[PDB]
Design a binder for these strands. Structure first.
Length: 405
RNA sequence: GCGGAUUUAGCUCAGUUGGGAGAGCGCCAGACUGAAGAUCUGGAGGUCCUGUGUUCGAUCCACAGAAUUCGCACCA
RNA sequence: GCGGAUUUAGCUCAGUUGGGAGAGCGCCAGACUGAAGAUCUGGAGGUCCUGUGUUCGAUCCACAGAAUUCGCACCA
């Protein structure tokens, strides 16, 4: 609950990704501050405001993703700040899956590192169509050559995963300095400060290079759950970015995937950053209250859609490679009925394998292809890779080949 | 997620000299007795949890994986 | 390791004329019994601790040894 959400400008989802500690989170807060300075009703957020759970404050790293809101003259933004530690890629993947564009933050003192690559690639397997780069920690370095180098590399890497690395915008800066400045004074405006001004460059880039997508409001409603909460007094809320179509209170929806069968509900709430929306539409990052569903009946990875519109998912075909005893895997074939655990991003769910006809027992080292039916619904997509582990070990590696349900 | 302990016959479990695959109970059979029970005797019964490695040789050693279990870490 | 005692049948033991290898118990069988037990019949049963020696002949005598067992290893 809180104010109403009133559409006055275009909406676009974005976020932060990059190697651990390259400063994604600092930069997130710095964006909040600076935009606020020129557009009041932009509520500012500091680090603690973002990296808020205790371990996050404890170990000093982002662990859960965070949604912050902010805007510019031109547009309104929902921004997901993701963790760069690899133990947490699943989350990063879930946030990146809501972005219409992503800010890839590369620390100039460190240059491209691993998650820098991984994130770019994963960003892609999840739909991010544009990336804008922000070469951070600049204050820490001054050899123009090391700057220029890092830039090349980043571009290159982008090229490798087919982003237009040659054209991608690359802003250099220090978010730590901008943030610090805003702390001394919150009203700094464009031109008042060097560091602060780089963020304006970033903000501009985001405004300019990442185009506003063309949402399909007419297609059947579909919104993939990204999270689920139990809100006091009201009920079960499911958050996510509408893929297409729309919703408003009163509409009944279908919770699809990751479970035996699908369940129906009527949407009784629609918000966007804790603010009422009459009807949310394709591109809104919202939250929906659902009549009757418990926290157990809805979860990340399932999907909200127009009843019957769809076949989160539970079943799918997949091309797999079973590892050799030698590669640390199994040492005995398996057959239909085998149910190990599947891992997609930060998700892990148990599933029953079903060998196609003409295939009876799959042996260690074979490249099979078969169907799996998950014990819970989850956000899938063809081409999505996964790992199969069971009994303490990794037993296979494969990719979604087609969504059964 | 962490970390501990466990995986050996159909059940419950031994098994550390790195070279023999085991005990009990059950399955059957022989002996027995009117007849059975009990006993005794014999037999059949095994991906030593899975894979790769070390080794003249692995149930045993190293490594990765899995299941179960108990303790902790998670919980709008 | 100092000395004595002991070592014969499955068990416990006799065995002194240097010439027969024994008893009791047990064990197996027969008879008897409805069967088993008890009794009667019968049968088997031996590295006389080992070796060597003395002797016409060795459980027996001599030497070496072994094993069991008991006592002994004490005085500034």
């Amino acid at each position: 609950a809180k104010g109403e959400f009133i559409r006055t400008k275009r909406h676009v989802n974005v976020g932060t990704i990059g190697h651990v500690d390259h400063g994604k989170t600092t930069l997130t807060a710095a964006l909040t501050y600076v935009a606020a300075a020129e557009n009041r009703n932009v509520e500012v957020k500091d680090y603690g405001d973002i990296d808020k759970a205790r371990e996050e404050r404890a170990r000093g790293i982002t662990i859960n993703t965070a949604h912050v809101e902010y805007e510019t003259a031109k547009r309104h933004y929902s921004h997901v700040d993701c963790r760069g530690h690899a133990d947490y890629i699943k989350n990063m993947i879930t946030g990146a899956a809501q972005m219409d564009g992503a800010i890839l933050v590369v620390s100039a003192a460190d240059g491209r590192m691993r998650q820098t690559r991984e994130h770019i690639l994963l960003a892609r397997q999840v739909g991010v169509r544009y990336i804008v780069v922000f070469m951070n920690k600049v204050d820490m370095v001054d050899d123009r050559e090391l700057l220029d180098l890092v830039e090349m590399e980043v571009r290159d890497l982008l090229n490798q995963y087919e982003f237009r690395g040659d054209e991608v915008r690359v802003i250099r800066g220090s978010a730590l300095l901008a943030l610090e400045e805003m702390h001394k004074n919150r009203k700094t405006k464009r031109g008042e400060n060097e560091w602060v001004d780089k963020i304006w460059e970033l903000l501009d880039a985001i405004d300019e290079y990442i185009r506003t997508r063309v949402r399909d409001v007419d297609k059947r409603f579909l919104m993939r759950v990204e999270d689920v909460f139990t809100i006091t007094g009201r009920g079960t809320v499911a958050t996510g970015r509408i893929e297409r179509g729309k919703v408003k209170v009163g509409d009944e929806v279908e919770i699809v995937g990751l479970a035996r069968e699908t369940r129906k509900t009527v949407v009784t709430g629609v918000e966007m950053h804790r603010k009422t929306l009459q009807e949310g539409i394709a591109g809104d990052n919202v939250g929906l209250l659902l009549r009757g569903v418990s926290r157990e009946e809805v979860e990340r990875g399932q999907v909200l859609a127009k009843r019957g519109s769809i076949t989160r998912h539970t079943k799918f075909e997949a091309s797999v490679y079973i590892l050799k005893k030698e590669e640390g895997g199994r040492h005995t074939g398996f057959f239909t009925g085998y149910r190990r655990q599947f891992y997609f991003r930060t998700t892990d769910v148990t599933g029953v394998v079903r060998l196609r006809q003409g295939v009876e027992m799959v042996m260690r080292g074979d490249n099979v292809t078969f169907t799996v039916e998950l014990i819970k619904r989850v956000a899938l997509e063809e081409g999505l890779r996964f790992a199969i582990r069971e009994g303490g070990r990794t037993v296979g590696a494969g990719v979604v080949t087609k969504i059964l349900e």
